[PDB]
Amino acid sequence: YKLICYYTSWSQYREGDGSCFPDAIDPFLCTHVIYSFANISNNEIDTWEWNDVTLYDTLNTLKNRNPKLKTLLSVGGWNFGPERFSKIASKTQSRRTFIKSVPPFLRTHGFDGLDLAWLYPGRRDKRHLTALVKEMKAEFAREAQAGTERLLLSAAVSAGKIAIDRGYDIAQISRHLDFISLLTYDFHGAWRQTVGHHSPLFRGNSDASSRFSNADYAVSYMLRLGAPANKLVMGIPTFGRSFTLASSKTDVGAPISGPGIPGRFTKEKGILAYYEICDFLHGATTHRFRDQQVPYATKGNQWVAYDDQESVKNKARYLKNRQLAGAMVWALDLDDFRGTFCGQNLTFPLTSAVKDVLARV
């Protein structure tokens, strides 16, 4: 089983304990660590933060402690305009120029592969997304001829039925991609004003519409479309999505006036790192949707939907039963990486639970 863990560029800037460097990563925890995110300029892969070349190095020296560890760089991300990806992928000339610029870059910085996080291609991109994956892979095969190990190629895909129908030719890209990471946790889409869990496992028996929104449907749908199980990786979040209530109602359906207050370290409305949620729980009331098998908490007018150790062990058990390739975690720097925020003195509590269940067979 594979354990793909994302580490983000900008977590170095958080204050105090919030700050996280490649340093803090247990080399034996995951099988693959993906650095986010690389940028694109003058049509070539390129760096993003001034000090990336350094952190690139830091991350990749973990391979000295664990020689089996594989690292990848990710291009794209949500703060990267899809129009930009779209503009590069549509013109064979600008597309070829980018592809050709990738291998040398990965090799200089010691990465073992590239990860595509185009979020998200639209109806008019489906065809180009395919041209890009296909041609890029071909470039990796051709490059392995130089006598070095073939570079890996992966992609982060939307887990929403409509997004999948609109911009992905799943059957096509799965034959060229090494693994596909299902973004099964952006379900309660930023849009509406009703409390809801962003990463439910199951349908949530007590609800008629938007049954398409849960890990289970997404996974079954991908297999129906043609993605083989041995390349599917299910995304497990390590953060919580918060809300500022607009009434005293706290159960399913309750109204929402907007996103929740920022976390002390995370400084971003609507989300909270797991280690922040641990602190938050003190004095909070905890509930758990039996149907979807995921927890949620409230305190004051703040409602938080999140994942704890057992909801995470659950998804992991599920993924094994459907015989998928492994799990994907977003993200290491949001988990309790110091191990000093969540009761127990364990480091990376959430990612380990996934790893424990995965190591059982």
Ligand X SMILES: CC(=O)N[C@@H]1[C@@H](O)[C@H](O[C@H]2O[C@H](CO)[C@@H](O[C@@H]3O[C@H](CO)[C@@H](O[C@@H]4O[C@H](CO)[C@@H](O[C@@H]5O[C@H](CO)[C@@H](O)[C@H](O)[C@H]5NC(C)=O)[C@H](O)[C@H]4NC(C)=O)[C@H](O)[C@H]3NC(C)=O)[C@H](O)[C@H]2NC(C)=O)[C@@H](CO)O[C@H]1O
Ligand Y SMILES: *[C@@H]1O[C@H](CO)[C@@H](O[C@H]2O[C@H](CO)[C@@H](O)[C@H](O)[C@H]2NC(C)=O)[C@H](O)[C@H]1NC(C)=O
Binding site membership: which residues? 49-50, 76-79, 120, 183-186, 241, 330
194 by DSSP, 3-state: which?
strand
Annotated binding site for chitin: 49-50, 76-79, 120, 183-186, 241, 330
Taking residues 119 to 148 in sequence order and writing x for each that binds ligand X by CB under 6 A, - otherwise, the string is x-----------------------------
Distance of closest approach, residue 156 Cβ to ligand X, in angstroms? 4
Taking residues 38 to 67 in sequence order and writing x for each that binds ligand X by CB under 6 A, - otherwise, the string is ------------x-----------------
Q: Which is nearer to ligand X, 84 or 96 (CB)?
A: 84
DSSP letter at 276 equals: H
CB neighbour list of residue 201: distance below 8 Å, 6 or more residues apart = 214, 215, 216, 292, 293, 294, 311, 314, 315, 318
Q: Which of residues 145-184 bind ligand X (CB under 6 A)?
A: 156, 183
Q: Which residues bind ligand Y (CB under 6 A)?
A: 39, 41, 48
The answer to the question of residue 13 lying near ligand X (CB under 6 A) is: yes
Following CA atoms 152, 77, 131, 33 in sequence, which dihedral angle do they give, to the nearest 10 degrees? 10
Q: Which is nearer to ligand X, 191 or 283 (CB)?
A: 191
| Bridging pattern class, strands 239-245 and 232-237 | unpaired
DSSP letter at 199 equals: S
Which of ligand X, ligand Y, none does residue 41 bind to, with CB < 5 to 8 Å depending on kind? Answer: ligand Y
Q: Which is nearer to ligand X, 93 or 187 (CB)?
A: 187
Following CA atoms 102, 86, 214, 265 in sequence, which dihedral angle do they give, to the nearest 10 degrees? 70
Out of 118, 280, 330, 337, the only residue in the binding site for ligand X (CB under 6 A) is 330
Residue of closest CB approach to ligand Y: 41
Residue 65 burial by CB count (10 A; 0-12/13-18/19+): exposed, middle or buried? exposed
Q: What is the spatial distance between Cα 9 and Cα 125, in angstroms, rounded to a whole number?
A: 28
Q: What is the spatial distance between Cα 74 and Cα 247, in angstroms, rounded to a whole number?
A: 41
Taking residues 266 to 305 in sequence order and writing x for each that binds ligand X by CB under 6 A, - otherwise, the string is -xx--x----------------------------------
Q: Give the binding-site size for ligand X (rule: CB under 6 A).
A: 18
Under 8 Å between Cβ of 94 and 134? no
CB neighbour list of residue 40: distance below 8 Å, 6 or more residues apart = 46, 75, 80, 84, 85, 88, 98
Q: Which is nearer to ligand X, 34 or 281 (CB)?
A: 34
Q: What is the spatial distance between Cα 186 and Cα 331, in angstroms, rounded to a whole number?
A: 14
Q: Which is nearer to ligand Y, 48 or 120 (CB)?
A: 48
Q: Which is nearer to ligand X, 156 or 218 (CB)?
A: 156
Distance of closest approach, residue 47 Cβ to ligand Y, in angstroms? 7
Under 8 Å between Cβ of 243 and 191? no
Which of ligand Y, ligand X, none does residue 179 bind to, with CB < 5 to 8 Å depending on kind? Answer: none
Q: Which is nearer to ligand Y, 41 or 257 (CB)?
A: 41
Distance of closest approach, residue 199 Cβ to ligand X, in angstroms? 10
Q: Is the peptide bond between 120 and the residue preceding it cis, with omega within 30 degrees of 0?
A: yes
Which of ligand Y, ligand X, none does residue 136 bind to, with CB < 5 to 8 Å depending on kind? Answer: none
Distance of closest approach, residue 283 Cβ to ligand X, in angstroms? 24
Which of ligand Y, ligand X, none does residue 39 bind to, with CB < 5 to 8 Å depending on kind? Answer: ligand Y
Measured from the Cβ of residue 63, the count of other Cβ atoms closer than 10 Å reads 16
Structure token pair of residue 182: 């299902």
The answer to the question of residue 202 lying near ligand X (CB under 6 A) is: no
The answer to the question of residue 28 lying near ligand X (CB under 6 A) is: no
Adjacent-strand bridge partners of 232? 180
Q: Which of residues 209-248 bind ligand X (CB under 6 A)?
A: 239
Q: What is the spatial distance between Cα 354 and Cα 344, in angstroms, rounded to a whole number?
A: 17
Helix ranges (H only) for 119-177 are 126-144, 161-167, 170-176
Q: Please report, as ranges, the residues that interact with ligand X according to CB under 6 A.
A: 9-10, 13, 37, 50, 77-79, 117, 119, 156, 183, 186, 239, 267-268, 271, 330
